[PDB]
Design a protein around this ligand. Structure first.
Ligand code: FES
Length: 141
């Protein structure tokens, strides 16, 4: 019975909701049109980590923008807010050099799809088991 159910009905574009799950933060960002476009503009060959790190799809899936969001429209980016270096909480609100998150502990930069682009972190921020169960609610777990 671990699953939790997050009401995202009030999350506007450019807002991140942070919820605690299994003791750690989950970031739920409703991405802006700029975030989405920028995420879709990155070639796989440009990425540090080409694996989607996404619990919801094949473990060998490529880290395309489309394989990083819950929805086809790419508005809903849900990920563990746990830096893949040493587990600090990355700072969002379009921070760092790649329009995403910056981990101030040792300077990891993640892009607008949560993919690692610069710094000592080895992997893209992982995506939890997560799905919409209706228009307004994301089940985590
Ligand atoms: S814990 Fe994030 S860069 Fe080291």
């Amino acid at each position: 019975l671990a699953s939790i159910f997050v009401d995202v009905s009030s999350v506007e574009p450019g807002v991140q909701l942070t919820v605690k799950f299994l003791g750690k933060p989950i970031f739920i960002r409703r991405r802006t049109e700029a975030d989405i476009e920028l995420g879709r503009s990155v070639q796989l060959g440009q990425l540090v980590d080409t694996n989607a790190r996404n619990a919801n799809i094949d473990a060998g899936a490529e880290a395309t923008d489309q394989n990083r969001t819950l929805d086809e429209a790419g508005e809903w980016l849900v990920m563990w807010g746990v830096c893949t270096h040493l587990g600090c909480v990355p700072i969002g609100g379009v921070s760092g050099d790649f329009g995403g998150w910056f981990c101030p502990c040792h300077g990891a930069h993640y892009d607008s799809a949560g993919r690692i682009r610069k710094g000592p972190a080895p992997e893209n921020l992982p995506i939890p088991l997560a799905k919409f169960i209706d228009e307004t609610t994301i089940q985590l777990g």
